[PDB]
């Protein structure tokens, strides 16, 4: 759950829904794509700070108040969302 925590303090929800979709890929659709995709959460974490674009919607995603460990955990949790 180390991901739910950060995701809770991080507005990642206002745009990333786990049961719905807003601006970014719904954590549920994101996990299904990068599910058990070890190594992917690491690449996604970079998109969190360096923003992401081209993996889902045409609109890129600005960086967030998160950090390295704050992005990785979110990456491993988003990919292993359970
Ligand atoms: C709306 C302003 C968003 C907020 C707030 C957050 N994210 Fe986001 N994210 C958003 C979009 C539109 C996209 C798709 C970008 C694309 O073109 O593919 C994303 C994507 C991600 C991804 C996936 C990156 C990839 O290359 O696949 C991750 C891992 C991600 N977002 C993480 C993330 C986190 C941790 C957030 C809270 C700090 C967060 N996003 C907020 C839009 C928005």
Give the topology, please.
Blueprint (H helix, E strand, L loop, with lengths): L1 H8 L2 H4 L11 H7 L6 H10 L18 H12 L3
Helix pairs in contact: 1-5, 4-5
Bound molecules: heme C.
GO molecular function, one term: iron ion binding
Keywords: Electron transport, Heme, Iron, Metal-binding, Periplasm, Signal, Transport
Protein name: Cytochrome c-551
What would your notes on this structure say?
Its main location: periplasm. This is Cytochrome c-551. Heme c binds at residues 12, 15-16, 61. One of its GO terms (molecular function) is electron transfer activity. It is found in: Periplasm. The structure is a monomer. With 82 residues, the chain is mostly helical. The chain has a single domain (2-82), classed as Cytochrome c-like domain (Cytochrome Bc1 Complex, Chain D, domain 2). Helices cover 50% and strands 0% of the residues. The protein has 5 helices and no strands. It has helices at residues 2-9, 12-15, 27-33, 40-49, 68-79. The protein is globular and about 30 Å long. The N and C termini lie close together (8 Å). Heme C binds next to helix 2, helix 4 and helix 5.
Quick gist of this model?
The protein is mainly α. The protein has helices spanning 2-9, 12-15, 27-33, 40-49, 68-79.
Give, in order, the helices and strands: HHHHH
CATH architecture: Orthogonal Bundle
- By oligomeric state, this entry counts as monomer
What kind of sheet is the major sheet? none
């Amino acid at each position: 759950q180390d991901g739910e925590a950060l995701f809770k303090s991080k507005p990642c929800a206002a745009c990333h829904s786990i049961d719905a979709k807003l601006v970014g890929p719904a954590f549920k659709e994101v996990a299904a794509k990068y599910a058990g995709q070890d190594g992917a959460a690491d690449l996604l974490a970079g998109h969190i700070k360096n923003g992401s674009q081209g993996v889902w919607g045409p609109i890129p995603m600005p960086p967030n108040p998160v950090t390295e460990e704050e992005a990785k955990i979110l990456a491993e949790w988003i990919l292993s969302q359970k």
